[PDB]
Design a protein around this nucleic acid. Structure first.
Lengths: 116, 67, 164, 98, 416, 166, 75
RNA sequence: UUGACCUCAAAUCAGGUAGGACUACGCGCUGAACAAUAAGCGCAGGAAAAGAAAAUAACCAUGAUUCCCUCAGUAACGGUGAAGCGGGAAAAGCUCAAAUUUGAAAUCUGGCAACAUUUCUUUUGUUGUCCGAGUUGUAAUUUCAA
RNA sequence: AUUGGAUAUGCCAUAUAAAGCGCUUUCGAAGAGUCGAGUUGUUUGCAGCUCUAAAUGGGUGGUCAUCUAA
């Protein structure tokens, strides 16, 4: 079998139309969730900083965001990752704190019974 | 967008709750015997505190009754 | 065939006289039916809908997970095990657990009879945890009878392989 | 502004943090109730034919043959050593009771 | 700071005692002090106020970890200190905590990882946590306090204390030491722990009653002596709280030095008891340690004392001791102390047979049952921490009989 | 609870109590059909942890297979064919002897309203779960085809991928 | 040393015993679980109070016939 | 004896459901020749499968699955031939078993009667009542991240 | 004409309720004819057969790290 790439420009267009389709549904919030900053796990790459999967629970507790609130305002949680050093904790705590500064959370209507 | 969020949050800000007929009569009876400051002995009275509410729940009941 | 002692013990059940006296106490503490429970709750509902504090209820304890937890908590005064549980390994440890926890226990006949006390088709085990002050002597006399007619009796027989 | 700069570095300075113990790492710890349940069941269930034979050899002080039989049945040494210790205490408890 | 003063005046503490004259001022400068004071001199405020100042001065936070470690020989003394430190830190934000022997070790580990700035510890439990507990941040240790150092040495924690000093950092860390008596072991420990050049500061009645009848005899005795002055000594504050609550629940109004663990209430209760011509007060040995005993017709030792050497000197109206048959070996120790004694005899008929009703009252009430478990557990743990292992052996104690005295049909599940 | 005692008793499969019950029930099961309905599971602890609830829509079936492919996989498939209107949830080992291995298969009725209204077993109603045992989607079926995570466990390497710009 | 010898077992050169209670001969005096007792066992049931409020609601809405008017409908 | 329970059957009893076809892609089982090869057999969907670590690593550590690029025609093996890292597309997490609701099976199907609702007189529910299921365990609560 | 997610607003709301965070002198269950061992076949995995477990245990890696199967 020989795989051909004639749909390469048609996949590019289809993926872009999905981003536009996604943005139409969720109008003002970002098309991606904020990702942490981590360091790759080798002696070849540990100097580089890249994006992680989600923020650790210890990073969210320091930033002031609970693990149940976090998912609702676009902050992924990684229950697996941990902070073995204070630099990873502070690098990503500041990342969450900056995110909260630039964030507008629209209020939600709440059911409110008469008494009690 | 920011103007709408603050004004709407101000409109939906009535977070304090009133008391129902049972809730008011419940907390009122506890206060009439133990005053308004001793909530620890208020929770330990099995006769009047049938639901066994702790001091923190009874404190929140009194606060909601004040307003 | 030859049966192990832990399964052989279920063929030696409580005698007819003691079992009949046991169920006289049990029938005083039947749980309220689905109909009687609804009547009591709707009666309190009208006292709330229009306008208006009790004692702890008294009933016999049932359920295999519930009763085993009560024995482990030493809350059970008398445990009555059905003699014909379809998978025997459901109650095959109960006489040993009751021995370890010092719970007076008996193996009674007709798991259906146990279910009738609790308004159910079937009960694997019944347990009396704590009864009214009027029935303290009646339960105490039953526990003494179970000691003599079940524990003092058999006992040496329950450690022997049955059948064959 | 929210933005991640990927590549280069962020800082070579290091400060090791002490991490707590995760709940999954607690697995295998013996419970007070599980130890009770196993003691009741072990007595109630009885013993396997190979456990009866192993118990016989320990009673006759032929521990060399007992350990060999347990390993031949169970498969490894540390499984045989654990079974012998479990059955030895059963004998000791039986002797104290009887 | 003003927060320290606002907390201190809440306790009703004014002026400042004599032992604190040579300790509190120099210690506020961060210099090592070798204190030495007798019982009841008020050392609890001596090594707590300056240390709490130093927490505020350095702006410590739970992420920093433990900064001050206070070591006490017994559960009751550590708990009493922890209760005082809670009062002093009422208007603070620095976290405080206690780790003790016989307590929930798993729960303590969860509290230690969160960050406890002011830790009150026992030598046995602290070494266990310092070696095994993960996430326990103590590299930023700055102050170390030892109270009743001689008591620690006599207990048998010399080996445990040695490893604590080897594990805990020694640089730039303030250290303290308090001992009623200065022995060779006390001096040796000070030389290896304290910094060089420190600022040095300077007739019996008993009733042989079984465990199950301990409370029933006590209750009947108090009913008989309702027209006198009675003071009862217990082995714990939790035991004090439960019996005081239970006695008021059976129409025998009493007073206790517990209150709500408020220092001002205890002084108020003691002052009222002294002023009153008749009444009954319950307290533990540590609470009454060093206090002024008023003119009391009856003193009752409901539970055996944890410091027999101090007790035999404190006694020197009438003295009573509730001694179990398994504790009859304490009688031989009295002869070695050369103290006259007499045996009290009581008839079994006159003892109140309310045990069945007592169990029903405890089982029906949530708070009575909760207090009964806490009192029973603390009494057993204090029993296991007694200095006289040979005399007051916990293993020889019958746990089924003991739980009967607390109003339990069966012994509750308490660990150690 | 009693499922702690039942599940620790199920580890001593050759003990006196378990051996007698294994041989007594193996004879009883041989007098019955090859595939027969079970009124209640013979291992209420093991069925309960495999997804079985004592409620309408949950069915237990016993089946014997000859000893000497996976024995448990064939039991799931044979019972699934026997009860074509049910969905095979899971299965387990109940008994064995010198000739036969006995298994109990948990099936769920995708048409019963007590199943279709229960969100925790609502997933089995979807058509993508038609004959899960037939496509190796059960617990033993997944294990049979070496599905798992790790180094212990084709088309994208036998093909030439020619891009547009190459 | 182990003498590198043989023990006559190397390949190279009561069927029905009585029940033995080695654990249940004694009686455990304390409960097995040390967990604290929840307050729900010393307070009126909250499950029933849920139903009572639900029944009291539908009595106001007229969904369930009250006891006094149940008898009138019967006769 | 009456009578409950467990069975074992029966009914042109009520309500349901399975088969066959397609099969490009998909998932199983089976299999020669010149290789999971064609065939043969079994089973799905609009995708399927996989999937929230009994996973990698040895680092300043990473973090479900899937696909693409790279690693790499490399290690390894005996010409076959990966994977970790790295770069992208997309991102979402959760549910049970094992706890006594025990101060109250709090749970569910069905019949019947009303009241609604509709892609729809064709659909889908609500409320009430009775019966059944269920204590050999149905709800609430908990899933280790706790 | 049929619909979807929001907005605004009227009415109803069984809240004596239900949650997140915080703190502990109290607790914390974790899946077996499986794992594994021997051996025989298919293509390490899988399968049969004989045997058959544990509880800081078990798996996979380099005393340590990581994971938490059935």
């Amino acid at each position: 079998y020989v795989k051909t790439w004639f749909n390469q420009p048609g996949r590019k267009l289809r993926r872009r139309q999905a981003r536009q389709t996604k943005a139409a549904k969720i109008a003002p919030r970002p098309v991606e969730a904020i990702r942490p900053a981590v360091k790759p796990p080798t002696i070849r790459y540990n100097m580089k900083v890249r994006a992680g999967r989600g923020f650790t629970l210890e990073e969210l507790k320091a930033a002031g965001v609970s693990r149940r609130v976090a998912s609702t305002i676009g902050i992924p949680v990684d229950h697996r990752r941990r902070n073995r050093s204070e630099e990873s904790l502070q690098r990503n705590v500041e990342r969450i704190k900056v995110y909260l500064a630039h964030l507008i959370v629209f209020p939600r209507k709440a059911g409110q019974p008469k008494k009690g | 967008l920011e103007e709408e969020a603050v004004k709407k949050a101000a409109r939906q800000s009535n977070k304090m709750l009133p008391l129902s007929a049972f809730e008011h009569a419940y907390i009122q009876r506890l206060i009439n015997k133990y005053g308004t400051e001793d909530f620890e002995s208020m929770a330990k009275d099995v006769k009047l505190n049938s639901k066994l509410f702790n001091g923190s729940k009874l404190k929140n009941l009194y606060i909601r009754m004040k307003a | 065939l030859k049966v192990p002692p832990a399964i052989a013990q279920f063929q030696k059940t409580l005698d007819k006289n003691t079992a009949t006296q046991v169920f006289k106490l049990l029938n005083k503490y039947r749980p309220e039916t689905a109909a009687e429970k609804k009547q009591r709750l709707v009666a309190e509902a009208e006292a709330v809908a229009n306008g208006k504090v009790s004692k702890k209820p008294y009933n016999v304890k049932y359920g295999l997970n519930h009763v085993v937890a009560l024995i482990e908590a030493k809350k059970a005064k008398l445990v009555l095990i059905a003699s014909d549980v379809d998978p025997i390994e459901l109650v095959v440890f109960l006489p040993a657990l009751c021995k370890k926890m010092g719970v007076p226990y008996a193996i009674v006949k007709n798991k259906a009879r146990l279910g009738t006390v609790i308004h159910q088709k079937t009960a694997a085990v019944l347990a009396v945890t704590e009864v009214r002050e009027e029935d303290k002597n009646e339960l105490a006399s039953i526990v003494s009878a179970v000691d003599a007619n079940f524990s003092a009796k058999y006992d040496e027989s329950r450690r022997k392989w049955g059948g064959g | 502004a929210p933005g991640l700069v990927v590549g280069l570095n962020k800082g070579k300075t290091l400060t090791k943090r002490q991490l707590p113990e995760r709940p999954s790492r607690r697995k295998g710890h013996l419970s007070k109730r599980t130890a009770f349940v196993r003691s009741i069941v072990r007595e109630v269930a009885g013993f396997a034919p190979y456990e009866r034979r192993v118990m016989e050899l320990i009673r006759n002080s032929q521990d060399k043959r007992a350990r060999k039989l347990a390993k031949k049945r169970l498969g490894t040494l540390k499984r045989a050593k654990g079974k012998i210790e479990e059955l030895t205490s059963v004998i000791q408890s039986s002797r104290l009771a009887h | 700071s003003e927060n320290i003063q606002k907390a201190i005046k809440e306790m009703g503490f004014e002026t400042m005692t004599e032992i604190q004259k040579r300790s509190i001022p120099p210690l506020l400068a961060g210099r090592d002090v070798l204190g030495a004071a007798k019982t009841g001199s008020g050392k609890t405020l001596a090594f707590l106020i300056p240390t709490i100042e130093m927490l505020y001065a350095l702006k410590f936070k739970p992420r920093n970890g433990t900064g001050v470690i206070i070591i006490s020989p017994t559960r009751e003394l550590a708990l009493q200190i922890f209760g005082v430190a809670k009062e002093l830190l009422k208007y603070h934000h620095q976290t405080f905590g206690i780790v003790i022997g016989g307590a929930n070790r798993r729960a303590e580990a969860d509290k230690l990882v969160k960050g406890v700035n002011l830790l009150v510890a026992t030598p046995g439990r602290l070494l266990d946590h310092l070696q095994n507990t993960k996430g326990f941040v103590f590299r930023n240790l700055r102050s170390l306090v030892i109270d009743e150092a001689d008591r620690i040495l006599e207990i048998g924690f010399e080996d445990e204390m040695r490893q604590i000093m080897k594990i805990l950092p020694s640089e730039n860390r303030q250290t303290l030491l308090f001992s009623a008596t200065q022995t060779t072991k006390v001096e040796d420990l000070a030389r290896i722990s304290l910094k060089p050049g420190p600022l040095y500061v300077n007739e019996q009645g008993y009733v042989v009653v079984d465990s199950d009848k301990r409370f029933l005899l006590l209750f009947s005795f108090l009913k008989r002596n309702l027209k006198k002055k009675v003071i009862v000594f217990m082995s714990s504050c939790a035991s004090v709280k439960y019996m005081a609550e239970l006695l008021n629940y059976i129409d025998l109004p009493v007073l206790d030095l517990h209150g709500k663990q408020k220092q001002q209430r205890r002084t108020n209760t003691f002052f009222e008891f002294c002023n009153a011509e008749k009444g009954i007060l319950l307290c533990t040995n540590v609470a009454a340690r060093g206090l002024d005993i008023p003119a009391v017709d009856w003193i009752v030792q409901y539970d055996p004392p944890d410091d027999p050497r101090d007790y035999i000197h404190r006694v020197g109206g009438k003295s009573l001791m509730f001694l179990a048959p398994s504790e009859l070996g304490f009688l031989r120790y009295l002869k070695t102390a050369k103290v006259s004694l007499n045996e009290f005899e009581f008839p079994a008929n006159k003892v109140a047979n309310v045990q069945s009703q007592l169990e029903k009252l405890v089982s029906k009430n949530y708070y009575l049952q909760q207090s009964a478990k806490d009192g029973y557990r603390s009494y057993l743990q204090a029993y296991a921490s007694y200095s006289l292992k040979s005399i007051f052996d916990i293993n020889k104690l019958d746990l089924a009989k003991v739980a009967k005295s607390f109003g339990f049909a069966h012994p509750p599940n308490v660990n150690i | 609870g009693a499922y702690k005692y039942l599940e620790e008793l199920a580890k001593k499969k050759q003990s006196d109590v378990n051996l007698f019950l294994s041989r007594v029930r193996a004879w009883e099961y041989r007098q019955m059909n090859v595939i027969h309905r079970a009124s209640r599971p013979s291992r209420p602890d093991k069925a309960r942890r495999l997804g079985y609830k004592a409620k309408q829509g949950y069915v237990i079936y016993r089946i014997r297979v000859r000893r000497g492919r996976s024995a448990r996989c064939t039991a799931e498939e044979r019972v699934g064919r026997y009860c074509s209107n049910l969905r095979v949830l899971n299965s387990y080992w109940v008994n064995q002897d010198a000739t036969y291995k006995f298994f109990e298969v948990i099936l769920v009725d995708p048409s019963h309203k007590a199943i279709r209204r229960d969100p925790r077993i609502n997933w089995i109603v979807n058509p993508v779960h038609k004959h899960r045992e037939s496509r190796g989607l059960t617990s033993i079926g997944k294990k049979s085809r070496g599905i798992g995570k790790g180094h212990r466990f084709w088309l994208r390497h036998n093909t030439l991928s020619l891009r547009r710009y190459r | 040393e182990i003498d590198a010898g043989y023990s006559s077992d190397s390949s190279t050169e009561d069927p029905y015993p009585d029940y033995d209670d080695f654990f249940t001969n004694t009686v455990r005096e304390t409960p097995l679980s040390s967990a604290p007792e929840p307050k729900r066992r010393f307070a009126p049931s909250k499950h029933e109070q849920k139903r009572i409020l639900q029944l009291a609601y539908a009595i106001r809405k007229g969904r369930i016939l009250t006891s006094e008017q149940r008898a009138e409908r019967e006769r």
